[PDB]
């Protein structure tokens, strides 16, 4: 129930994490997470209903999605928790994240195919099934489509924004949520997707297990923001068309509200916050 920085995992932790992810893939459960995510990324729109993305609920929706995934991992190996990837610190292809004992590295230049680590197509253990094209292998181009990951300075500038979110509660908004998501400003979360490349740059981005570590760190930064701004909280707080208000339930679960997800400590803590 402690989420740790990936860079600190022990050998046994890396091994049990990899094995639990590979077993969810084998059993077919993994791909339904990919499919769920792609349906929301394709349906959430700036002028209409928006729940998982480009909206205030981006943060509690991904918090609950990651909890669903972590619980599924724990059903395979109850010792496993989601690690997080602090991409402001671990910002090169030589980060141990990308070593063959963890997520494997970048893809080759010819077709972007990942050639090492447990998720390489050659293993036979990571078919890409839920996809938008004929390619069935994990792809990445670390640092190919954008030169640099966000820096700590840039992260700090976003953490300093006091308002959680602002009308019109979409990709055009000012405030914390949209600057963290990245549609405005220096760009944190979106730019990391673009920096990894391959399936992480697409609507079927959970095909890459780094998805979970990226979102675990985005989730950490929300928790950091709450600490800096104890007088700020989720908005909107009632009656907003197309947007999940604080006490409204969210799809697909329908049984949980942003209000139920504001305090992460009800589900996990961090190694250091």
């Amino acid at each position: 129930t402690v989420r740790k920085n990936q860079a600190t995992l022990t050998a046994d932790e890396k091994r049990r994490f990899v094995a639990a992810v590979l077993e969810l893939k084998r059993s077919g459960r993994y791909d339904e997470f990919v499919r769920t995510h792609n349906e929301f990324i394709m349906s959430d729109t700036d002028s209409g209903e928006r729940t998982g993305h480009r909206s205030p609920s981006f943060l509690p929706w991904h918090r609950r999605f990651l909890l669903d995934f972590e619980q599924a991992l724990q059903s395979v190996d109850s010792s496993v928790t989601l690690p997080y990837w602090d991409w402001s610190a671990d910002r090169t292809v030589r980060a141990s994240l990308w070593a063959p004992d963890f997520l494997g590295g970048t893809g080759r230049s010819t077709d972007g195919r990942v050639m090492d680590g447990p998720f390489a197509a050659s293993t036979g253990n990571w078919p890409i099934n839920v996809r938008v094209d004929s390619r069935t292998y994990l792809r990445r181009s670390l640092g190919g489509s954008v030169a640099e990951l966000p820096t700590r300075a840039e992260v700090e500038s976003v953490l300093a924004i006091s308002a959680y979110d602002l009308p019109p509660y979409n990709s055009a908004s000012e405030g914390f949520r949209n600057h963290l998501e990245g549609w405005r400003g220096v760009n944190l979360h979106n730019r990391v997707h673009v920096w990894v490349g391959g399936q992480m740059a697409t609507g079927v981005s959970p095909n890459d297990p780094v998805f979970w570590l990226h979102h675990a760190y985005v989730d950490k930064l929300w928790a950091e923001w709450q600490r800096r701004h104890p007088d700020s909280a989720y908005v909107p707080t009632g009656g907003t068309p197309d947007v999940v208000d604080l006490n409204e339930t969210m799809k697909p679960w329908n049984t949980v509200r942003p209000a139920d997800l504001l305090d992460h400590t009800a589900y996990y803590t961090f190694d250091a916050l």
């Binding site: 394709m42 729109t45 077709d111 972007g112 094209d133 055009a172 979106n190 697409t202 609507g203 981005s205």
Partner: protein
């Protein structure tokens, strides 16, 4: 007020756009005759399902970005 239609061969592939599981979709894009999911952001930029975190100014730019992403691969029809 939708962008104009277009039709060209980009890096050997035919890309088309026209004004018209997912959303509304007031504009359609195709790569070699397969529909590509695209979306318009509030600021007027566009993205597609194969480049969803990387806004480009126009639907033709999104189609070209998809051809770049696909590296020759056929597109599968969306949902």
């Amino acid at each position: 007020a939708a962008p104009e239609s277009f039709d060209e061969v980009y890096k050997g592939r035919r890309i088309q756009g026209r004004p018209a599981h997912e959303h509304g979709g007031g504009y359609e894009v195709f790569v070699d005759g397969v529909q590509l999911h695209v979306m318009r952001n509030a600021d007027g930029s566009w993205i597609s399902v194969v480049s969803h975190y990387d806004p480009v100014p126009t639907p033709r730019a999104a189609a070209r970005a998809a051809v770049d992403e696909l590296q020759g691969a056929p597109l599968l029809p969306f949902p």
